Amino acid sequence: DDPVVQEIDVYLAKSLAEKLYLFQYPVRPASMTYDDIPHLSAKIKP
Amino acid sequence: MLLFCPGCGNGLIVEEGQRCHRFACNTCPYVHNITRKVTNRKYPKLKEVDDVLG
Amino acid sequence: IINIKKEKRETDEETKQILRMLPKDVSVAELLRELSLTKEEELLFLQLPDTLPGQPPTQDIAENACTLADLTEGQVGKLLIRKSGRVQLLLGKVTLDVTMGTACSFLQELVSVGLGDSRTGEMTVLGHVKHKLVCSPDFESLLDHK
Amino acid sequence: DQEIVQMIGTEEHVMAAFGPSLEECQKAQIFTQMQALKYIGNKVRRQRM
Ligand SMILES: [Zn+2]
């Protein structure tokens, strides 16, 4: 079992290391998204 | 059967509105009118013929 | 009735309760169909081990944890797909293995929350997350090596 | 309630068996954490003053 194909490279980015967040909705299936829902604001704390 | 509101996720009761029966949530104004037939079969196991033991 | 706001069934994979009228994939075939069958980019969410096989470069130390926050940009490793469906990650002298994580069906939006100013910031929706990968050390190889 | 049901299970028989509990909870006006905590506290007794 040799690496015949798919020798993909891996790069690293530090531009958004401190500005990248992951938001997941446990109650909203992936089929329906909030792209069409107009948002108003977002409160947050550092 | 059990259905949930996409808004908050609570259970949806069925109620008679002003035009047609509709699913509705008890904690938000979300509603959904019924257009076509909706069925939920359970297929109970029946009784079987049991035999003449002896 | 609006078509993009119908009632959702309990099964997130079969929410199509009313219509107008999935086999468990593998990482090798996943990447194959992501690159060969199509060319559109995809956002993945992989889980790396706690400590990477490296040393914090001039980070003031101790054999502490080495995460991506200490490594610099550029090529850090390669991704190999051997025969029989093996998917490995060569991150230096050692080689980890990549497997498919829990099949998430709920909405996962990868966004960038950049606080450019101390009073007003920008939230940038980068994309959607669909698949999850898990990278694990090949402990068998590390043990049979020495 | 959707999250609770997903945590219990996604199998048809699981939801069929858990339906009665959801209905009994819906009969009451408990829908938030504060209301449930107040109900629990009402169902709590002091350890003899
Ligand atoms: Zn609702």
Short mmCIF file of C-alpha atoms and ligand atoms in Angstrom, two decimals:
data_model
loop_
_atom_site.label_atom_id
_atom_site.label_comp_id
_atom_site.label_asym_id
_atom_site.label_seq_id
_atom_site.Cartn_x
_atom_site.Cartn_y
_atom_site.Cartn_z
CA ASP A 1 0.00 0.00 0.00
CA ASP A 2 2.13 2.85 -1.35
CA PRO A 3 1.05 6.49 -1.84
CA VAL A 4 0.04 6.06 -5.47
CA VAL A 5 -1.89 9.34 -5.75
CA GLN A 6 -3.26 12.32 -3.80
CA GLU A 7 -0.02 13.70 -2.36
CA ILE A 8 -1.70 16.85 -1.08
CA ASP A 9 0.34 19.51 0.71
CA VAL A 10 -0.55 21.09 4.06
CA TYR A 11 -0.01 24.81 4.70
CA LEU A 12 -0.57 26.87 7.84
CA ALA A 13 -2.11 30.34 8.18
CA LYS A 14 -1.83 32.68 11.17
CA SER A 15 -3.74 35.67 9.77
CA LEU A 16 -7.06 34.80 11.47
CA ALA A 17 -5.64 32.81 14.39
CA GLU A 18 -7.30 35.10 16.95
CA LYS A 19 -10.28 36.18 14.80
CA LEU A 20 -11.67 32.77 13.76
CA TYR A 21 -14.74 31.44 15.58
CA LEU A 22 -16.88 28.37 14.91
CA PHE A 23 -20.64 28.82 15.28
CA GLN A 24 -22.78 25.67 15.18
CA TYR A 25 -26.56 25.45 15.60
CA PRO A 26 -27.50 22.14 17.30
CA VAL A 27 -31.20 22.70 16.47
CA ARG A 28 -30.90 23.91 12.86
CA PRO A 29 -30.26 21.24 10.19
CA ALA A 30 -27.58 21.97 7.61
CA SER A 31 -30.22 22.12 4.86
CA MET A 32 -31.71 25.44 6.01
CA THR A 33 -29.25 28.29 6.56
CA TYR A 34 -29.49 31.84 7.91
CA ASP A 35 -28.22 33.44 4.69
CA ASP A 36 -31.64 34.93 3.88
CA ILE A 37 -32.49 35.92 7.48
CA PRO A 38 -31.57 39.62 7.93
CA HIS A 39 -29.45 39.99 11.05
CA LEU A 40 -29.53 43.09 13.25
CA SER A 41 -26.66 42.92 15.76
CA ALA A 42 -24.33 40.67 17.74
CA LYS A 43 -23.22 41.26 21.33
CA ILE A 44 -19.89 39.72 22.31
CA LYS A 45 -17.17 39.91 24.96
CA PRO A 46 -13.42 39.50 24.33
CA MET B 1 -46.54 12.71 15.18
CA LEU B 2 -43.74 14.69 16.82
CA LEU B 3 -42.74 17.82 14.92
CA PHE B 4 -40.68 20.83 15.99
CA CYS B 5 -40.67 24.51 15.11
CA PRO B 6 -37.64 25.64 13.06
CA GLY B 7 -37.64 28.88 15.05
CA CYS B 8 -37.27 27.66 18.64
CA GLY B 9 -37.51 23.86 18.33
CA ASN B 10 -40.46 23.20 20.63
CA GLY B 11 -43.20 20.69 19.91
CA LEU B 12 -45.87 21.61 17.38
CA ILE B 13 -49.52 21.12 18.33
CA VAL B 14 -52.29 20.99 15.71
CA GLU B 15 -54.99 23.64 15.97
CA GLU B 16 -57.94 24.91 13.96
CA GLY B 17 -57.17 28.37 12.58
CA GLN B 18 -59.34 30.81 10.66
CA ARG B 19 -58.89 29.10 7.27
CA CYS B 20 -57.45 25.62 7.80
CA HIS B 21 -55.90 23.38 10.44
CA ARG B 22 -52.27 24.22 11.13
CA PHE B 23 -49.26 23.22 13.17
CA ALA B 24 -48.42 25.82 15.81
CA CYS B 25 -45.92 26.32 18.62
CA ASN B 26 -46.97 27.35 22.12
CA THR B 27 -43.99 29.68 22.69
CA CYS B 28 -43.80 31.64 19.41
CA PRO B 29 -46.15 32.93 16.68
CA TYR B 30 -44.76 30.44 14.13
CA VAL B 31 -47.46 28.48 12.29
CA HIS B 32 -47.63 26.15 9.30
CA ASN B 33 -50.82 25.52 7.33
CA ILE B 34 -51.60 22.03 6.03
CA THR B 35 -51.83 21.89 2.23
CA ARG B 36 -52.06 18.17 1.36
CA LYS B 37 -52.74 14.99 3.32
CA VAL B 38 -50.27 14.03 6.05
CA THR B 39 -50.22 10.50 7.48
CA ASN B 40 -48.16 8.66 10.10
CA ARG B 41 -48.64 4.89 10.06
CA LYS B 42 -47.50 2.65 12.91
CA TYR B 43 -48.13 -0.86 11.53
CA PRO B 44 -48.94 -2.68 14.79
CA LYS B 45 -47.93 -6.24 14.99
CA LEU B 46 -51.09 -8.21 14.73
CA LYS B 47 -52.21 -11.27 16.62
CA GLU B 48 -50.92 -14.34 15.01
CA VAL B 49 -52.69 -17.59 14.61
CA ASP B 50 -51.46 -19.61 17.50
CA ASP B 51 -51.46 -23.34 17.27
CA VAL B 52 -53.02 -26.42 18.65
CA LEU B 53 -50.46 -27.33 21.23
CA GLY B 54 -50.87 -30.69 22.81
CA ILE C 1 -46.84 27.30 1.01
CA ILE C 2 -43.24 28.49 1.15
CA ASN C 3 -40.84 25.70 0.17
CA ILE C 4 -37.77 26.81 2.17
CA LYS C 5 -39.58 26.87 5.55
CA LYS C 6 -41.44 23.55 5.68
CA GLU C 7 -41.65 21.54 8.88
CA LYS C 8 -38.51 19.54 9.62
CA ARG C 9 -38.60 15.85 10.52
CA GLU C 10 -36.67 14.54 13.52
CA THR C 11 -34.09 12.82 11.29
CA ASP C 12 -31.80 15.61 10.10
CA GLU C 13 -30.78 13.41 7.16
CA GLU C 14 -34.44 12.88 6.11
CA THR C 15 -36.07 16.22 6.93
CA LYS C 16 -38.00 15.99 3.62
CA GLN C 17 -41.24 14.87 5.24
CA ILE C 18 -43.37 16.25 2.39
CA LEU C 19 -42.16 16.34 -1.22
CA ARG C 20 -43.43 18.15 -4.31
CA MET C 21 -44.04 14.76 -5.97
CA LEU C 22 -26.77 7.63 3.13
CA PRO C 23 -23.79 5.24 3.16
CA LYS C 24 -20.84 6.06 5.40
CA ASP C 25 -18.14 7.59 3.20
CA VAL C 26 -14.38 7.28 3.70
CA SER C 27 -11.65 9.92 3.72
CA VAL C 28 -9.83 8.56 0.65
CA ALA C 29 -12.98 8.51 -1.49
CA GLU C 30 -14.01 11.82 0.08
CA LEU C 31 -10.88 13.58 -1.16
CA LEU C 32 -11.03 11.70 -4.48
CA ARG C 33 -14.56 12.91 -5.25
CA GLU C 34 -13.69 16.37 -3.92
CA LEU C 35 -10.78 16.74 -6.36
CA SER C 36 -11.40 14.36 -9.28
CA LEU C 37 -15.19 14.34 -9.60
CA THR C 38 -15.40 18.08 -8.85
CA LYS C 39 -13.07 21.06 -8.47
CA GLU C 40 -15.06 23.28 -6.09
CA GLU C 41 -13.31 24.18 -2.84
CA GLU C 42 -14.58 22.76 0.45
CA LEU C 43 -14.21 23.78 4.09
CA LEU C 44 -13.19 20.96 6.43
CA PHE C 45 -12.84 20.82 10.22
CA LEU C 46 -10.09 18.45 11.36
CA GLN C 47 -9.05 17.67 14.94
CA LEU C 48 -5.29 17.56 15.53
CA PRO C 49 -3.72 15.87 18.57
CA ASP C 50 -2.96 17.82 21.73
CA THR C 51 0.80 17.94 21.06
CA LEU C 52 2.38 18.05 17.60
CA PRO C 53 5.72 16.35 16.83
CA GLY C 54 7.69 19.59 17.08
CA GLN C 55 9.21 22.23 19.33
CA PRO C 56 7.95 25.80 19.87
CA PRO C 57 10.37 27.85 17.74
CA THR C 58 11.96 30.44 20.05
CA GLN C 59 8.75 30.68 22.11
CA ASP C 60 10.47 30.77 25.53
CA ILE C 61 9.84 27.07 26.22
CA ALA C 62 10.32 21.89 28.88
CA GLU C 63 8.56 19.44 26.54
CA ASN C 64 5.37 21.50 26.66
CA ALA C 65 2.47 21.32 24.22
CA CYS C 66 3.26 22.33 20.63
CA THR C 67 0.11 23.55 18.85
CA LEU C 68 -0.46 25.40 15.58
CA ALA C 69 -0.23 28.72 17.44
CA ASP C 70 3.55 28.23 17.75
CA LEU C 71 4.28 27.04 14.20
CA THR C 72 4.92 29.47 11.36
CA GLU C 73 3.36 29.68 7.90
CA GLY C 74 4.44 27.63 4.89
CA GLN C 75 4.50 23.94 4.13
CA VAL C 76 4.25 21.99 7.39
CA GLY C 77 3.30 18.49 6.20
CA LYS C 78 2.01 16.30 3.41
CA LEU C 79 -1.15 14.21 2.99
CA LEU C 80 -0.67 10.72 1.54
CA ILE C 81 -3.39 8.35 0.33
CA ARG C 82 -2.02 4.81 0.12
CA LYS C 83 -3.78 1.76 -1.30
CA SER C 84 -6.63 -0.08 0.46
CA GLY C 85 -8.05 3.24 1.70
CA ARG C 86 -5.26 4.32 4.06
CA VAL C 87 -5.06 8.09 4.61
CA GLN C 88 -1.92 9.28 6.39
CA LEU C 89 -0.46 12.69 7.25
CA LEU C 90 3.34 12.97 7.12
CA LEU C 91 4.07 15.89 9.47
CA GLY C 92 7.84 15.33 9.64
CA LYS C 93 9.56 12.17 10.85
CA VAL C 94 6.32 10.68 12.20
CA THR C 95 3.12 9.91 10.29
CA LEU C 96 -0.37 10.29 11.74
CA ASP C 97 -3.57 8.75 10.34
CA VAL C 98 -6.68 10.69 9.31
CA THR C 99 -10.14 9.17 9.75
CA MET C 100 -13.71 10.39 9.36
CA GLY C 101 -15.14 12.03 12.46
CA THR C 102 -18.70 12.12 13.70
CA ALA C 103 -21.06 12.75 10.78
CA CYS C 104 -22.59 16.09 11.75
CA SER C 105 -25.91 16.93 10.10
CA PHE C 106 -26.74 20.22 11.84
CA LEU C 107 -25.72 23.63 10.53
CA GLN C 108 -22.07 24.56 11.11
CA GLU C 109 -21.04 28.01 9.85
CA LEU C 110 -17.33 28.86 9.91
CA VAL C 111 -17.14 32.64 10.40
CA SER C 112 -14.35 35.13 11.10
CA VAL C 113 -15.01 37.59 13.94
CA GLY C 114 -12.33 40.25 13.50
CA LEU C 115 -12.31 43.08 16.06
CA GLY C 116 -10.53 45.66 13.94
CA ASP C 117 -11.47 48.45 16.35
CA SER C 118 -11.96 48.40 20.12
CA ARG C 119 -15.51 49.75 19.62
CA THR C 120 -16.72 48.20 16.33
CA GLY C 121 -15.74 44.89 14.75
CA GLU C 122 -16.67 42.88 11.67
CA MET C 123 -18.16 39.38 11.55
CA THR C 124 -17.28 37.64 8.27
CA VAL C 125 -19.05 34.41 7.30
CA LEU C 126 -16.27 32.39 5.65
CA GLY C 127 -18.36 29.36 4.73
CA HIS C 128 -20.17 26.23 5.87
CA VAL C 129 -18.69 23.15 7.56
CA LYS C 130 -20.03 19.77 6.43
CA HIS C 131 -17.43 17.06 7.13
CA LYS C 132 -15.18 16.47 10.15
CA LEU C 133 -11.83 14.68 10.21
CA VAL C 134 -9.80 13.25 13.09
CA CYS C 135 -6.00 12.98 13.03
CA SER C 136 -4.46 10.46 15.42
CA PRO C 137 -0.89 9.31 16.10
CA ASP C 138 -0.05 5.90 14.63
CA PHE C 139 0.91 4.49 18.02
CA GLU C 140 1.62 1.06 16.52
CA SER C 141 4.35 2.50 14.30
CA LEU C 142 5.78 4.62 17.12
CA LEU C 143 5.98 1.50 19.30
CA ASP C 144 7.44 -0.90 16.72
CA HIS C 145 10.00 1.75 15.71
CA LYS C 146 11.81 1.62 19.07
CA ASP D 1 -37.36 20.17 22.94
CA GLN D 2 -35.69 19.31 19.63
CA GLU D 3 -32.29 19.14 21.33
CA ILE D 4 -33.71 16.96 24.10
CA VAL D 5 -35.24 14.55 21.58
CA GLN D 6 -32.00 14.41 19.59
CA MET D 7 -30.15 13.61 22.82
CA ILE D 8 -32.59 10.82 23.73
CA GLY D 9 -32.49 9.26 20.27
CA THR D 10 -33.54 9.54 16.64
CA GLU D 11 -35.10 6.07 16.31
CA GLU D 12 -38.81 5.93 15.54
CA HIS D 13 -39.64 3.76 18.56
CA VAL D 14 -37.56 6.05 20.80
CA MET D 15 -39.64 9.09 19.82
CA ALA D 16 -42.84 7.03 20.06
CA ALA D 17 -41.95 6.09 23.65
CA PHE D 18 -40.78 9.59 24.62
CA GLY D 19 -43.81 11.37 23.14
CA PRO D 20 -45.89 11.03 26.31
CA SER D 21 -43.23 12.79 28.38
CA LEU D 22 -43.09 15.70 25.92
CA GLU D 23 -46.89 15.94 25.98
CA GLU D 24 -47.00 15.91 29.78
CA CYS D 25 -44.38 18.67 29.89
CA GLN D 26 -46.33 20.67 27.29
CA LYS D 27 -49.50 20.41 29.39
CA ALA D 28 -47.65 22.52 31.97
CA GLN D 29 -46.32 26.05 31.41
CA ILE D 30 -42.67 25.05 31.93
CA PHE D 31 -40.70 26.26 28.90
CA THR D 32 -37.66 28.11 30.32
CA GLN D 33 -34.89 27.28 32.76
CA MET D 34 -36.23 29.68 35.40
CA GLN D 35 -39.69 28.08 35.41
CA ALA D 36 -38.27 24.56 35.70
CA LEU D 37 -35.94 25.64 38.51
CA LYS D 38 -38.86 27.27 40.32
CA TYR D 39 -40.90 24.08 39.96
CA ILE D 40 -38.02 22.00 41.31
CA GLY D 41 -37.57 24.36 44.25
CA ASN D 42 -41.29 24.07 44.95
CA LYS D 43 -40.67 20.30 44.96
CA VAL D 44 -37.81 20.75 47.48
CA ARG D 45 -38.09 20.47 51.27
CA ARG D 46 -35.77 21.97 53.87
CA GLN D 47 -33.59 19.55 55.84
CA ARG D 48 -35.49 20.29 59.06
CA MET D 49 -34.92 24.05 59.30
ZN ZN E 1 -41.88 26.99 17.77
#
